[PDB]
């Protein structure tokens, strides 16, 4: 019975194949059929291409050798190579044109999710071209979805030599009968077959996947739309910056390019952006997913005033200073969304662009107490419950698993009614002791939040709500200003606290404001609708933030 | 007696002043003298410029108000503003033209080094222009050299209002008589004088610095060339990546732009690059200064084979994978220089560019044992002493302070003779018990290395020398290759181990190789000649690495 799946790169995980480019070049230049492909394979195992595939020579060293083989081939075929014939040009173009075959990767992802050991076995070269980064990026994106990547040029062995197959089996720790092997080259598939492995000759992806699902007994074709890539906390780069003597800020970092600072809500973690971190990095950005003050690995001082917007924003500026960042794009959700509008109002020179999920920008009312304002809205009643130091902590800290299972629910699974929370004396007074697992979260994801909250609890997080008068006074200083930097407001249809209509008057203060809207989405935007969050954010980043 | 120095930004720490641009614009456009400067200050404390300087409005909100004042001024002066008159254009150009007045910053740096509390007190605005990043970068570079930065638009007070002076004194925790205040505007200097502060009207920098050194009794003018900015370990962003189950890699990170990976030598730290980290970040690069395997906060497994070049390089590739980096420029010194040439030979697609300080690239001799090769060179004799597990550890770990004080010495201070180290039975057998402090290092810098080495000692670091046969076998696989990616070789005149002549045959393997050479420089290149290392590296990075 099968437990491992092996995939080739060219013509299997990446399309179009390089072999298909040499053929297309012959057709385009009106060269004799197979002339280029013949020069490419000249001398077979003793040839320059074998030396290249084994790692004896680099791609740049190979270009002149291929040129000589092409001249030799044209001499025998009694033909002439065109005036400006260039192998460098042909290969640069071929390599650049090659993209990931998404449904093949999806099938590999599914087999791995169902327990398979997945591997990439490829005949490749050591790329030293000026444009090598494209291929490096491709390999980077691909390799992280697999248990092993076996490259001919690194192992000094090549397909179809029998030793590379015995090497593959040794790294898989699997007998041939337990392995599926997919290849577009019949000759390279032959030694795997001879060893007793299940083999698939890949021509078109659809037929290959039919053969693959028939042989594994796992649905790979016509499958539901998959979730975006998530994060394994232990595989991330973890960063730490001291912003002041008793305060350290933790963050997870991924990708290269313009700095994108992610700011979570209450009661969350850097991990609330797990479905956005890989996507934004992949889109050409350097992601900095924060553990906000009072959360996870960041410091959680006990004093209420350590959590007023003025100090939180100042500390985020210091965070940029210490990292050597003159700017970052600030993307926030919930309480993070509020911080982010305040970063744009008080430090526009430090904010490349600003985006908020669910949280609208509403200017302070100088004629009314924030206490009065909160009482005017019945959904904002649970905020009065959060005021008394200790009361909400005791309930939230009592059973951590219960807390996150009760809170982190999709729009159609609600267990909480935020009207009369004070009257009823708590958020979970009509919630079960053992809530069911929401469709948005796995048991393991809940246990990550439980472990994070075991360090500091709910004092620091609840203190974000305990600075109303202080935040109101500070916000009143910005009443004459406008947000004129690039800005995005994302509303969530089914968020019954941060309702889309609460954002209706935003253009009076943010005239150039851009919008996004997510149908059938509750309060937990990022995990509720990850695919659509990523699509809105990426489109806005490439257009307005660079 | 003086203990604090306060500096204005415009016309003091940054030149040319904005006031000087409005005047130059009038002259260039043949406008009535002072017309623009008059519109700029229209309405005084009730005017739009005061509202802007107090943070009531942003710069973009101010542009139209300045335009109305300019129209009003031209109406009264019975003149006409030109066809395409633009305040946005004038101010963009002015702000962009403004650079740091380096000798003023140098004097501030010296006063701070001699115990002074330094501060920037400036009348400024909340910048929301599309081109605000330039100014953000300027402020970033400047602010880190001072104890305090007081901005009018953040405090809601403005010069020359007396309250900002009383605010300045409160943040300095100093009485007026203990403060020097430098300003280019006489009116803004007047309230500081009235309070009893020492004041300096800054016209030309030279005269201002003469007044400043005369009043402080500290040499600020005609001073020796200063060292580049160094790092305070506790003010850095510290990163951690798990590359495999028992191995974690630590790094310090600073700046934005192309990733530059710094790789130290034996027996060093990320801190050996302290004079390069701020400089390279300032030059437009994202610096990743490594704690190499076996050092500081990185894991130090005991097994010898965990330190062969093959595993060290593979782990550096994984480090890139986990950080989401398709490429980095690799800059190495000593053992780090060797790793870096091997990263270019085995993973060119991952290396944007490669640079080595002191360490040459010498291909393996397939006809000779690395043991034979090391015996052929008498300077490489101390390497035989390092072979026996435990012997060199015991001597190096005996007294940590002695170890670093004995090793980290300039070319004219040597205490070690590496010929007959085995015969004499140790590196420090003719070295004093209490070595003097070298001119290159402070006592505090030695104590940083002592604390770092207390965690894991010398086993892991010495294990880098214990893989000769393994490294030789692996290197022999690359004998047919060439380094064809951008490459820099930096030689140090007075390095008596890694002598410049050892690098003489490098173009046979690296044809496009670029060179740098440092006169009167020993083995500890980075701290020996920091200014010249930074100049060579920055010039090569901007030309060949982007
Ligand atoms: C001042 S504001 O309007 O920006 N703002 C900050 C964010 C806050 N968010 C919030 O309170 N979220 C929760 C998240 C869950 C669900 C519900 C109750 C409890 C637990 C707090 C709303 C609403 C008010
Ligand atoms: C194989 S190599 O030629 O690249 N190589 C690695 C780096 C090594 N460097 C080195 O041994 N440096 C030290 C640094 C001080 C001073 C002296 C003795 C001891 C302590 C080792 C040289 C020389 C050989």
PDB file of C-alpha atoms in Angstrom, chain A residues 52-309:
ATOM      1  CA  UNK A  52      25.894  19.927 -15.948  1.00  0.00           C
ATOM      2  CA  UNK A  53      23.089  17.737 -14.441  1.00  0.00           C
ATOM      3  CA  UNK A  54      25.619  15.987 -12.126  1.00  0.00           C
ATOM      4  CA  UNK A  55      26.982  19.352 -10.820  1.00  0.00           C
ATOM      5  CA  UNK A  56      30.456  18.980 -12.478  1.00  0.00           C
ATOM      6  CA  UNK A  57      29.964  22.372 -14.213  1.00  0.00           C
ATOM      7  CA  UNK A  58      27.598  25.367 -13.769  1.00  0.00           C
ATOM      8  CA  UNK A  59      24.939  26.614 -16.264  1.00  0.00           C
ATOM      9  CA  UNK A  60      27.168  29.539 -17.428  1.00  0.00           C
ATOM     10  CA  UNK A  61      30.044  27.085 -18.119  1.00  0.00           C
ATOM     11  CA  UNK A  62      27.547  24.875 -20.079  1.00  0.00           C
ATOM     12  CA  UNK A  63      26.212  27.669 -22.440  1.00  0.00           C
ATOM     13  CA  UNK A  64      29.411  27.671 -24.687  1.00  0.00           C
ATOM     14  CA  UNK A  65      29.503  23.830 -24.754  1.00  0.00           C
ATOM     15  CA  UNK A  66      25.827  23.703 -25.945  1.00  0.00           C
ATOM     16  CA  UNK A  67      26.723  26.316 -28.627  1.00  0.00           C
ATOM     17  CA  UNK A  68      29.539  24.021 -29.965  1.00  0.00           C
ATOM     18  CA  UNK A  69      27.130  21.017 -29.999  1.00  0.00           C
ATOM     19  CA  UNK A  70      24.583  23.161 -31.932  1.00  0.00           C
ATOM     20  CA  UNK A  71      27.275  24.215 -34.488  1.00  0.00           C
ATOM     21  CA  UNK A  72      28.406  20.487 -34.823  1.00  0.00           C
ATOM     22  CA  UNK A  73      24.699  19.377 -35.310  1.00  0.00           C
ATOM     23  CA  UNK A  74      23.967  22.052 -38.007  1.00  0.00           C
ATOM     24  CA  UNK A  75      27.257  21.029 -39.820  1.00  0.00           C
ATOM     25  CA  UNK A  76      26.056  17.362 -40.056  1.00  0.00           C
ATOM     26  CA  UNK A  77      22.399  18.305 -40.916  1.00  0.00           C
ATOM     27  CA  UNK A  78      23.873  20.532 -43.758  1.00  0.00           C
ATOM     28  CA  UNK A  79      22.005  23.638 -42.418  1.00  0.00           C
ATOM     29  CA  UNK A  80      22.860  27.125 -41.077  1.00  0.00           C
ATOM     30  CA  UNK A  81      22.096  28.572 -37.637  1.00  0.00           C
ATOM     31  CA  UNK A  82      20.573  32.124 -37.855  1.00  0.00           C
ATOM     32  CA  UNK A  83      22.620  35.407 -37.705  1.00  0.00           C
ATOM     33  CA  UNK A  84      21.924  36.080 -33.950  1.00  0.00           C
ATOM     34  CA  UNK A  85      21.448  32.537 -32.519  1.00  0.00           C
ATOM     35  CA  UNK A  86      21.801  32.659 -28.670  1.00  0.00           C
ATOM     36  CA  UNK A  87      21.506  29.737 -26.183  1.00  0.00           C
ATOM     37  CA  UNK A  88      21.584  32.249 -23.251  1.00  0.00           C
ATOM     38  CA  UNK A  89      18.495  34.014 -24.734  1.00  0.00           C
ATOM     39  CA  UNK A  90      16.591  30.739 -25.470  1.00  0.00           C
ATOM     40  CA  UNK A  91      17.231  29.361 -21.947  1.00  0.00           C
ATOM     41  CA  UNK A  92      16.604  32.710 -20.100  1.00  0.00           C
ATOM     42  CA  UNK A  93      13.188  32.928 -21.886  1.00  0.00           C
ATOM     43  CA  UNK A  94      12.362  29.178 -21.307  1.00  0.00           C
ATOM     44  CA  UNK A  95      13.269  29.325 -17.540  1.00  0.00           C
ATOM     45  CA  UNK A  96      11.322  32.622 -17.085  1.00  0.00           C
ATOM     46  CA  UNK A  97       8.218  31.220 -18.884  1.00  0.00           C
ATOM     47  CA  UNK A  98       8.132  28.159 -16.561  1.00  0.00           C
ATOM     48  CA  UNK A  99       5.449  28.511 -13.843  1.00  0.00           C
ATOM     49  CA  UNK A 100       4.186  26.162 -11.089  1.00  0.00           C
ATOM     50  CA  UNK A 101       1.567  23.674 -12.350  1.00  0.00           C
ATOM     51  CA  UNK A 102      -0.926  24.611  -9.553  1.00  0.00           C
ATOM     52  CA  UNK A 103      -3.284  21.509  -9.755  1.00  0.00           C
ATOM     53  CA  UNK A 104      -0.209  19.154  -9.530  1.00  0.00           C
ATOM     54  CA  UNK A 105       1.044  21.064  -6.406  1.00  0.00           C
ATOM     55  CA  UNK A 106      -2.557  20.936  -5.000  1.00  0.00           C
ATOM     56  CA  UNK A 107      -2.643  17.109  -5.445  1.00  0.00           C
ATOM     57  CA  UNK A 108       0.830  16.837  -3.751  1.00  0.00           C
ATOM     58  CA  UNK A 109      -0.509  19.079  -0.904  1.00  0.00           C
ATOM     59  CA  UNK A 110      -3.592  16.803  -0.474  1.00  0.00           C
ATOM     60  CA  UNK A 111      -1.516  13.534  -0.463  1.00  0.00           C
ATOM     61  CA  UNK A 112       0.781  15.114   2.217  1.00  0.00           C
ATOM     62  CA  UNK A 113      -2.306  16.258   4.246  1.00  0.00           C
ATOM     63  CA  UNK A 114      -3.604  12.647   4.142  1.00  0.00           C
ATOM     64  CA  UNK A 115      -0.323  11.266   5.590  1.00  0.00           C
ATOM     65  CA  UNK A 116       1.943  10.730   2.511  1.00  0.00           C
ATOM     66  CA  UNK A 117       5.703  11.485   2.434  1.00  0.00           C
ATOM     67  CA  UNK A 118       6.135  13.780  -0.597  1.00  0.00           C
ATOM     68  CA  UNK A 119       9.330  14.438  -2.552  1.00  0.00           C
ATOM     69  CA  UNK A 120      10.659  16.335  -5.573  1.00  0.00           C
ATOM     70  CA  UNK A 121      13.231  14.349  -7.581  1.00  0.00           C
ATOM     71  CA  UNK A 122      14.674  16.486 -10.386  1.00  0.00           C
ATOM     72  CA  UNK A 123      17.485  16.538 -12.971  1.00  0.00           C
ATOM     73  CA  UNK A 124      18.781  20.102 -12.512  1.00  0.00           C
ATOM     74  CA  UNK A 125      21.779  22.472 -12.789  1.00  0.00           C
ATOM     75  CA  UNK A 126      23.784  24.936 -10.614  1.00  0.00           C
ATOM     76  CA  UNK A 127      22.404  28.231 -11.929  1.00  0.00           C
ATOM     77  CA  UNK A 128      24.913  31.164 -11.991  1.00  0.00           C
ATOM     78  CA  UNK A 129      23.161  33.350 -14.622  1.00  0.00           C
ATOM     79  CA  UNK A 130      22.547  37.054 -13.866  1.00  0.00           C
ATOM     80  CA  UNK A 131      18.773  36.116 -13.834  1.00  0.00           C
ATOM     81  CA  UNK A 132      19.075  32.974 -11.543  1.00  0.00           C
ATOM     82  CA  UNK A 133      16.791  34.592  -8.876  1.00  0.00           C
ATOM     83  CA  UNK A 134      13.578  33.713 -10.806  1.00  0.00           C
ATOM     84  CA  UNK A 135      14.329  29.977 -10.627  1.00  0.00           C
ATOM     85  CA  UNK A 136      15.546  30.398  -6.946  1.00  0.00           C
ATOM     86  CA  UNK A 137      12.120  31.977  -6.146  1.00  0.00           C
ATOM     87  CA  UNK A 138      10.286  29.092  -7.954  1.00  0.00           C
ATOM     88  CA  UNK A 139      12.243  26.386  -6.061  1.00  0.00           C
ATOM     89  CA  UNK A 140      11.654  28.260  -2.769  1.00  0.00           C
ATOM     90  CA  UNK A 141       7.882  28.376  -3.262  1.00  0.00           C
ATOM     91  CA  UNK A 142       7.787  24.665  -4.286  1.00  0.00           C
ATOM     92  CA  UNK A 143      10.266  23.021  -1.835  1.00  0.00           C
ATOM     93  CA  UNK A 144       8.446  24.109   1.380  1.00  0.00           C
ATOM     94  CA  UNK A 145       5.376  22.036   0.414  1.00  0.00           C
ATOM     95  CA  UNK A 146       7.461  18.796   0.318  1.00  0.00           C
ATOM     96  CA  UNK A 147       9.335  16.553   2.804  1.00  0.00           C
ATOM     97  CA  UNK A 148      12.357  16.225   0.472  1.00  0.00           C
ATOM     98  CA  UNK A 149      13.867  17.934  -2.587  1.00  0.00           C
ATOM     99  CA  UNK A 150      16.436  15.762  -4.398  1.00  0.00           C
ATOM    100  CA  UNK A 151      18.481  17.633  -7.023  1.00  0.00           C
ATOM    101  CA  UNK A 152      20.747  15.722  -9.414  1.00  0.00           C
ATOM    102  CA  UNK A 153      23.420  18.510  -9.375  1.00  0.00           C
ATOM    103  CA  UNK A 154      23.647  18.324  -5.534  1.00  0.00           C
ATOM    104  CA  UNK A 155      23.764  14.490  -5.318  1.00  0.00           C
ATOM    105  CA  UNK A 156      26.109  14.041  -8.367  1.00  0.00           C
ATOM    106  CA  UNK A 157      23.814  11.302  -9.796  1.00  0.00           C
ATOM    107  CA  UNK A 158      21.300  11.660 -12.630  1.00  0.00           C
ATOM    108  CA  UNK A 159      18.024  10.179 -13.961  1.00  0.00           C
ATOM    109  CA  UNK A 160      17.915   7.509 -15.473  1.00  0.00           C
ATOM    110  CA  UNK A 161      20.970   6.031 -13.599  1.00  0.00           C
ATOM    111  CA  UNK A 162      19.709   3.315 -11.166  1.00  0.00           C
ATOM    112  CA  UNK A 163      21.657   4.760  -8.152  1.00  0.00           C
ATOM    113  CA  UNK A 164      19.515   7.948  -7.894  1.00  0.00           C
ATOM    114  CA  UNK A 165      16.401   5.667  -7.483  1.00  0.00           C
ATOM    115  CA  UNK A 166      18.119   3.652  -4.733  1.00  0.00           C
ATOM    116  CA  UNK A 167      19.124   7.062  -3.224  1.00  0.00           C
ATOM    117  CA  UNK A 168      15.472   8.268  -3.478  1.00  0.00           C
ATOM    118  CA  UNK A 169      14.209   5.065  -1.696  1.00  0.00           C
ATOM    119  CA  UNK A 170      16.870   5.490   1.045  1.00  0.00           C
ATOM    120  CA  UNK A 171      15.783   9.133   1.796  1.00  0.00           C
ATOM    121  CA  UNK A 172      12.063   8.128   1.694  1.00  0.00           C
ATOM    122  CA  UNK A 173      12.727   5.167   4.136  1.00  0.00           C
ATOM    123  CA  UNK A 174      10.225   3.258   1.931  1.00  0.00           C
ATOM    124  CA  UNK A 175      10.176   0.117  -0.171  1.00  0.00           C
ATOM    125  CA  UNK A 176       9.465   0.543  -3.924  1.00  0.00           C
ATOM    126  CA  UNK A 177       5.865  -0.866  -3.724  1.00  0.00           C
ATOM    127  CA  UNK A 178       4.956   1.965  -1.215  1.00  0.00           C
ATOM    128  CA  UNK A 179       5.965   4.710  -3.799  1.00  0.00           C
ATOM    129  CA  UNK A 180       4.173   6.571  -6.665  1.00  0.00           C
ATOM    130  CA  UNK A 181       6.542   8.245  -9.074  1.00  0.00           C
ATOM    131  CA  UNK A 182       5.340  10.867 -11.612  1.00  0.00           C
ATOM    132  CA  UNK A 183       7.491  11.819 -14.603  1.00  0.00           C
ATOM    133  CA  UNK A 184       6.917  13.309 -18.087  1.00  0.00           C
ATOM    134  CA  UNK A 185       9.959  11.356 -19.551  1.00  0.00           C
ATOM    135  CA  UNK A 186       9.280   7.651 -20.212  1.00  0.00           C
ATOM    136  CA  UNK A 187      12.976   6.698 -20.089  1.00  0.00           C
ATOM    137  CA  UNK A 188      13.347   8.271 -16.562  1.00  0.00           C
ATOM    138  CA  UNK A 189      10.189   6.499 -15.374  1.00  0.00           C
ATOM    139  CA  UNK A 190      11.471   3.055 -16.620  1.00  0.00           C
ATOM    140  CA  UNK A 191      14.030   2.443 -13.705  1.00  0.00           C
ATOM    141  CA  UNK A 192      11.357   3.238 -11.070  1.00  0.00           C
ATOM    142  CA  UNK A 193       8.959   0.708 -12.773  1.00  0.00           C
ATOM    143  CA  UNK A 194      11.797  -1.961 -12.947  1.00  0.00           C
ATOM    144  CA  UNK A 195      12.292  -1.460  -9.123  1.00  0.00           C
ATOM    145  CA  UNK A 196       8.547  -2.093  -8.475  1.00  0.00           C
ATOM    146  CA  UNK A 197       7.349   1.502  -7.896  1.00  0.00           C
ATOM    147  CA  UNK A 198       3.905   2.694  -9.098  1.00  0.00           C
ATOM    148  CA  UNK A 199       4.681   4.959 -12.073  1.00  0.00           C
ATOM    149  CA  UNK A 200       2.690   7.632 -13.874  1.00  0.00           C
ATOM    150  CA  UNK A 201       3.679   8.956 -17.299  1.00  0.00           C
ATOM    151  CA  UNK A 202       2.542  12.599 -17.098  1.00  0.00           C
ATOM    152  CA  UNK A 203       1.392  14.085 -20.408  1.00  0.00           C
ATOM    153  CA  UNK A 204      -1.625  16.257 -19.448  1.00  0.00           C
ATOM    154  CA  UNK A 205      -2.152  16.941 -15.717  1.00  0.00           C
ATOM    155  CA  UNK A 206      -5.864  15.895 -15.644  1.00  0.00           C
ATOM    156  CA  UNK A 207      -5.168  12.304 -16.870  1.00  0.00           C
ATOM    157  CA  UNK A 208      -2.103  12.035 -14.556  1.00  0.00           C
ATOM    158  CA  UNK A 209      -4.247  13.099 -11.550  1.00  0.00           C
ATOM    159  CA  UNK A 210      -6.983  10.569 -12.573  1.00  0.00           C
ATOM    160  CA  UNK A 211      -4.301   7.790 -12.535  1.00  0.00           C
ATOM    161  CA  UNK A 212      -2.936   9.216  -9.242  1.00  0.00           C
ATOM    162  CA  UNK A 213      -6.349   9.312  -7.421  1.00  0.00           C
ATOM    163  CA  UNK A 214      -7.301   5.839  -8.788  1.00  0.00           C
ATOM    164  CA  UNK A 215      -4.006   4.381  -7.433  1.00  0.00           C
ATOM    165  CA  UNK A 216      -3.984   6.190  -3.997  1.00  0.00           C
ATOM    166  CA  UNK A 217      -7.748   6.081  -3.277  1.00  0.00           C
ATOM    167  CA  UNK A 218      -7.652   9.806  -2.341  1.00  0.00           C
ATOM    168  CA  UNK A 219      -9.795  12.474  -4.110  1.00  0.00           C
ATOM    169  CA  UNK A 220      -7.323  14.841  -5.872  1.00  0.00           C
ATOM    170  CA  UNK A 221      -9.448  15.912  -8.842  1.00  0.00           C
ATOM    171  CA  UNK A 222     -12.631  18.118  -8.575  1.00  0.00           C
ATOM    172  CA  UNK A 223     -11.759  18.727  -4.918  1.00  0.00           C
ATOM    173  CA  UNK A 224     -13.140  21.801  -2.972  1.00  0.00           C
ATOM    174  CA  UNK A 225     -11.132  25.061  -3.209  1.00  0.00           C
ATOM    175  CA  UNK A 226      -8.214  24.571  -0.700  1.00  0.00           C
ATOM    176  CA  UNK A 227      -7.309  26.945   2.174  1.00  0.00           C
ATOM    177  CA  UNK A 228      -4.205  29.211   1.641  1.00  0.00           C
ATOM    178  CA  UNK A 229      -0.839  27.961   3.132  1.00  0.00           C
ATOM    179  CA  UNK A 230      -0.761  28.368   6.965  1.00  0.00           C
ATOM    180  CA  UNK A 231       2.228  28.685   9.395  1.00  0.00           C
ATOM    181  CA  UNK A 232       3.875  26.118  11.602  1.00  0.00           C
ATOM    182  CA  UNK A 233       5.032  28.324  14.591  1.00  0.00           C
ATOM    183  CA  UNK A 234       8.309  26.301  14.991  1.00  0.00           C
ATOM    184  CA  UNK A 235       9.318  26.826  11.301  1.00  0.00           C
ATOM    185  CA  UNK A 236       9.159  30.659  11.501  1.00  0.00           C
ATOM    186  CA  UNK A 237      11.847  33.298  12.098  1.00  0.00           C
ATOM    187  CA  UNK A 238      11.043  34.812  15.543  1.00  0.00           C
ATOM    188  CA  UNK A 239      12.176  38.394  16.199  1.00  0.00           C
ATOM    189  CA  UNK A 240      12.548  40.362  19.469  1.00  0.00           C
ATOM    190  CA  UNK A 241      13.005  44.142  19.974  1.00  0.00           C
ATOM    191  CA  UNK A 242      13.280  45.978  23.353  1.00  0.00           C
ATOM    192  CA  UNK A 243      11.273  49.233  22.865  1.00  0.00           C
ATOM    193  CA  UNK A 244      11.926  50.415  26.497  1.00  0.00           C
ATOM    194  CA  UNK A 245      13.449  48.908  29.772  1.00  0.00           C
ATOM    195  CA  UNK A 246      10.494  46.703  30.779  1.00  0.00           C
ATOM    196  CA  UNK A 247       8.944  46.234  27.261  1.00  0.00           C
ATOM    197  CA  UNK A 248      10.010  43.780  24.574  1.00  0.00           C
ATOM    198  CA  UNK A 249       7.998  43.205  21.320  1.00  0.00           C
ATOM    199  CA  UNK A 250       7.856  39.807  19.571  1.00  0.00           C
ATOM    200  CA  UNK A 251       7.165  39.248  15.843  1.00  0.00           C
ATOM    201  CA  UNK A 252       7.323  36.549  13.187  1.00  0.00           C
ATOM    202  CA  UNK A 253       9.101  37.515   9.931  1.00  0.00           C
ATOM    203  CA  UNK A 254       8.770  36.172   6.366  1.00  0.00           C
ATOM    204  CA  UNK A 255       9.724  37.379   2.878  1.00  0.00           C
ATOM    205  CA  UNK A 256      11.706  40.173   1.208  1.00  0.00           C
ATOM    206  CA  UNK A 257      10.497  43.548  -0.127  1.00  0.00           C
ATOM    207  CA  UNK A 258       8.432  46.440   1.329  1.00  0.00           C
ATOM    208  CA  UNK A 259       7.838  45.994   5.104  1.00  0.00           C
ATOM    209  CA  UNK A 260       4.212  45.071   5.980  1.00  0.00           C
ATOM    210  CA  UNK A 261       3.409  45.294   9.694  1.00  0.00           C
ATOM    211  CA  UNK A 262       0.448  43.068  10.808  1.00  0.00           C
ATOM    212  CA  UNK A 263      -1.466  44.139  13.946  1.00  0.00           C
ATOM    213  CA  UNK A 264      -3.935  41.692  15.556  1.00  0.00           C
ATOM    214  CA  UNK A 265      -7.057  42.269  17.668  1.00  0.00           C
ATOM    215  CA  UNK A 266      -8.510  41.178  21.028  1.00  0.00           C
ATOM    216  CA  UNK A 267      -7.848  38.444  22.366  1.00  0.00           C
ATOM    217  CA  UNK A 268      -5.484  37.304  19.602  1.00  0.00           C
ATOM    218  CA  UNK A 269      -1.864  36.554  18.474  1.00  0.00           C
ATOM    219  CA  UNK A 270       0.586  36.985  15.522  1.00  0.00           C
ATOM    220  CA  UNK A 271      -0.955  33.526  14.600  1.00  0.00           C
ATOM    221  CA  UNK A 272      -4.315  35.153  13.688  1.00  0.00           C
ATOM    222  CA  UNK A 273      -2.462  36.160  10.406  1.00  0.00           C
ATOM    223  CA  UNK A 274      -1.227  32.575   9.704  1.00  0.00           C
ATOM    224  CA  UNK A 275      -3.132  32.417   6.362  1.00  0.00           C
ATOM    225  CA  UNK A 276      -1.852  35.881   5.295  1.00  0.00           C
ATOM    226  CA  UNK A 277       1.871  35.522   6.297  1.00  0.00           C
ATOM    227  CA  UNK A 278       2.903  33.032   3.484  1.00  0.00           C
ATOM    228  CA  UNK A 279       0.596  34.722   0.852  1.00  0.00           C
ATOM    229  CA  UNK A 280       1.900  38.308   1.400  1.00  0.00           C
ATOM    230  CA  UNK A 281       5.562  37.068   1.473  1.00  0.00           C
ATOM    231  CA  UNK A 282       4.875  35.168  -1.788  1.00  0.00           C
ATOM    232  CA  UNK A 283       3.412  38.402  -3.265  1.00  0.00           C
ATOM    233  CA  UNK A 284       6.755  40.291  -2.817  1.00  0.00           C
ATOM    234  CA  UNK A 285       6.507  41.664   0.738  1.00  0.00           C
ATOM    235  CA  UNK A 286       8.525  41.467   3.994  1.00  0.00           C
ATOM    236  CA  UNK A 287       5.907  40.488   6.576  1.00  0.00           C
ATOM    237  CA  UNK A 288       6.292  41.421  10.252  1.00  0.00           C
ATOM    238  CA  UNK A 289       3.409  39.749  12.155  1.00  0.00           C
ATOM    239  CA  UNK A 290       3.275  41.268  15.665  1.00  0.00           C
ATOM    240  CA  UNK A 291       2.480  39.879  19.085  1.00  0.00           C
ATOM    241  CA  UNK A 292       0.897  43.173  20.303  1.00  0.00           C
ATOM    242  CA  UNK A 293       1.757  44.506  23.796  1.00  0.00           C
ATOM    243  CA  UNK A 294       0.238  42.178  26.428  1.00  0.00           C
ATOM    244  CA  UNK A 295       0.209  39.149  24.106  1.00  0.00           C
ATOM    245  CA  UNK A 296       2.200  35.963  23.530  1.00  0.00           C
ATOM    246  CA  UNK A 297       5.958  36.569  23.629  1.00  0.00           C
ATOM    247  CA  UNK A 298       5.661  40.370  23.930  1.00  0.00           C
ATOM    248  CA  UNK A 299       5.840  41.983  27.389  1.00  0.00           C
ATOM    249  CA  UNK A 300       2.645  42.344  29.405  1.00  0.00           C
ATOM    250  CA  UNK A 301       3.149  45.079  32.076  1.00  0.00           C
ATOM    251  CA  UNK A 302       0.256  45.249  34.635  1.00  0.00           C
ATOM    252  CA  UNK A 303      -0.386  49.040  34.570  1.00  0.00           C
ATOM    253  CA  UNK A 304      -3.487  50.214  32.639  1.00  0.00           C
ATOM    254  CA  UNK A 305      -1.816  53.362  31.164  1.00  0.00           C
ATOM    255  CA  UNK A 306       0.916  51.208  29.477  1.00  0.00           C
ATOM    256  CA  UNK A 307      -1.972  50.296  27.049  1.00  0.00           C
ATOM    257  CA  UNK A 308      -3.260  53.754  26.034  1.00  0.00           C
ATOM    258  CA  UNK A 309      -3.067  54.415  22.236  1.00  0.00           C
TER     259      UNK A 309
END
